[PDB]
Amino acid sequence: MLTDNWKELAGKAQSTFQKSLKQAIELADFDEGLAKRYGALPSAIGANVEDFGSPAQFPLEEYLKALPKKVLDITEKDPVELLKDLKSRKVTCVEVLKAYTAASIVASKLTNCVQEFLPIEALQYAQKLDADYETKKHLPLYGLPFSIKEMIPFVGRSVTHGSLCYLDRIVDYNADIVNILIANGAYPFVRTTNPQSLMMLECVSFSHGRTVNAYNGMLTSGGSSGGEGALNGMRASPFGLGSDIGGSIRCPAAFNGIYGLRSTLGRIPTADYFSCNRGSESILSVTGPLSRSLDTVNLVMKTVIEAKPWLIDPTLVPLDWKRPENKKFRVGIYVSDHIVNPSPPINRALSMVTEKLKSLGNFEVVTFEPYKPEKVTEILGKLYFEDGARDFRATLQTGEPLLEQTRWAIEGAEDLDMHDQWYWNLQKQAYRKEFLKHWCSYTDNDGNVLDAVIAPVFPNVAAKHETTKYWTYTSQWNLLDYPVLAFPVTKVDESLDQPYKNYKPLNDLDKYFYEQYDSPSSFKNAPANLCLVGLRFTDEKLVEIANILRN
């Protein structure tokens, strides 16, 4: 690592971004009308990484007004549909790159979701893909650009996960999943922001400033894949890759009203990502796609898994990506863990999705009760930072300040002795086994297991900054390693989502979240998403049920 003063390093980070932003504008080739509107947009980028600017109230509305038909006709197109145009040559690989580059630039200024553009290598990828049209026409993602979280290695770049001390950590390789996607006709064109330590459900770092929600600029984008949620919520990327060890894929997707899949560990390669606590295996992160488009989520998983990634990454299981043949479904609704109750907008989403499933004949819908959700915090309290956060704190030798959200994640971290880790590994495996028995207790008399559970992603829609003080609605499924797909349902409705009256809080933490929901106007136009949870390796059931819920 580095030991220079952090203010100098933040400058170096800003320079890298500004250097890539300059090259991107050249690639995008604005006409004067757009250059004018772009110049006049409210920015979530400040003068320094501690200055958070003055973001728009509805960044997405500003985005749709600012960008021309020449761009939106491509970036607003569903990526699976756009792949048809790229295949039939109604649109060029370079043409698509130019539009999405322009979109990401406008998205970058409005939400601060881009850490580094990749226009040099992206133009080379897109140019040769056009030249090779006849031989690569058949590839399943031919011509499609995509975004990658900054923690994902890309050739010749620093990989820092937001820590300034790692700005000299250059890799000469791509992540396995990136090379696989390139082998299938795609290419990365932008690197998205990630926060300090990665262990916050928001997106603040001293490498980029603060990332904000795509639908309401006063709220967080979520985290840790906050850039990914914002960029793909603005539909300025066809899809992106994030990571999820505590909700870091599903929380951004839910806050920005798009799809995000925490895929089951052992399906797609993620270990070559960079994070804190490298070599820690007690609790493992997973990767997975975020996209505006469910069909795009499904196609990336299918494309990656059909490339047989277990022949490059031996931690992976050779299990085909297969659409389920189920005609009937048994589904549970997780109304609350009875520790922190959901805010009205989430509560209405649960009823909406419940009533829709009941209206289809082939769904049996039951209430799903929690199982010792307090044990999630206790076990993850010992295993997230099992070295007592020594590795993370060493990143602060530059003088880099400790963010308030990071404080929550590392407070109480013990430096575990080997026997302490063994104790909590046994606690971890026992809880997983107990929870499976809980899930199977919902099997019916004929032996039909629960296919999926519908649950909140968070006790609320996109949070106000520095208030993501409860993780269980996402970290529960990291402790269990269950596949979870966040999906859209509705938006805040000011008539329907007034605060609960005569509410009696369940505890101090529940009271905090109740008071956080002061009125729906504080979360105007914020998406209310939910998630589908399945047993391990049932990812595809979740996609199929999400398909039905959106038709």
Added chain:
Amino acid sequence: MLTDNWKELAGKAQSTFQKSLKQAIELADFDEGLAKRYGALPSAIGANVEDFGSPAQFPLEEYLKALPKKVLDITEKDPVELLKDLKSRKVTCVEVLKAYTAASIVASKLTNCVQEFLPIEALQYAQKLDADYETKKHLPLYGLPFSIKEMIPFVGRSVTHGSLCYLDRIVDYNADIVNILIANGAYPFVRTTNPQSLMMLECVSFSHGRTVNAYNGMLTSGGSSGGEGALNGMRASPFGLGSDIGGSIRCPAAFNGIYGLRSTLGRIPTADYFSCNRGSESILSVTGPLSRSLDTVNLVMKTVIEAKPWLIDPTLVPLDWKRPENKKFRVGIYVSDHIVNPSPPINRALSMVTEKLKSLGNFEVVTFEPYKPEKVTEILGKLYFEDGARDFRATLQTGEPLLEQTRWAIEGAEDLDMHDQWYWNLQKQAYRKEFLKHWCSYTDNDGNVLDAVIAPVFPNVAAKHETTKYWTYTSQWNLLDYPVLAFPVTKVDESLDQPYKNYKPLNDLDKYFYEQYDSPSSFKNAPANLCLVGLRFTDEKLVEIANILRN
């Protein structure tokens, strides 16, 4: 022993220093810019051992201003980090020697902390250590120079503990701890000043003059390891070795705002040092490191103990240096012994450290009351000079004048008959047993012992010259042989540290110290340190708690 006139002897002592200063300058190889600025620095070295010069108001800024970045970039780096560079070969052993030699010369002139430079042997050590780089780089202290108190034997040197009469007492061997450290890749490069009789908390002798504080040149460096405290407070040595029989390691470290460990007697080899009263065993001195770097204090202890020094020194215990397994801590706060109250700057430091420990969940904090502190003076008054100071007074046959501070230490000394010593040995052991019961009286209902005590090192920050008239805040732990680690907290603040008002002194000596603190301006920029006290052989618990207090 010599009986020549002391003025002739002071000449020879100045001559030995002056020749080594010349050779040190020859090794450091100042460019003209530094040589000119060095020449213009206010000197604390006089023309004779009775002329104390005119020291700088703030020696440390003058040190930082005079030296080039080429030197400070090495000497200001934490030594543990610097060890990585020597290991990584980013810097050569001779390069580190050259910088620290230059640093010590500037420190010598500003504070008068060096008795003799060792540039000939240091170049021999550093050169051959680079030549043997491939075979010795694995050693835990490869390439690191260090300072040694003048009382510590080094090959070919006189060992005088500041007494002119011992200038012909030449040793042909190093101290055991030094040979252990050399075998682990380190080497001494400078000998630091020690005062007359070693029994003062200041540093005045007729071998060197007067040594002054690194942060305020009107105040004492402390003693008896005054040179070590000044040199390492100026960060002109990675670490040093001192001795402590009455506070002589913790007082210098506290006065100069660095770390200093009075280690438990049986852990580290010290008996081959030279002092007065050789063969006296009723109260034994100990050694231990002083450094600005806690990690360096810990590593030196770990390095020497892992060399199994009990196989050379049979007084030592084969007790491993072990990081404690404690996850929770119980700590007492010792605000005062109610004989001499601490001045405001020490009192504020106690509040800072209490509240920071209370803010962490894993610390229980209780008040720690004194136990017969008056008996400390009584017993040590008889055992410090149990021959009636006959051995020390004979050093003055040269005519060497008796310093005012030495007068305090030898006034009232009885020449004990065997039965008198037996009586006071029993008094010493009874008090030790009683105090242990007192400490264990703070054990909680669940059986959790007190892990450490927070206490002052002295009734005030760095004292005015000839005012160190109370020892108990350090001596109590020599009577008990408890490990004590001095550690930094804060500096004097003229707004925060005004004299208490309407103060009612507890006794004449408390009044003396109250009037001594006329205003904070008299102690401008003075570090206010505290210390951590532990039971015998719990040294490492103190390191771990000091580690938490700085994070």
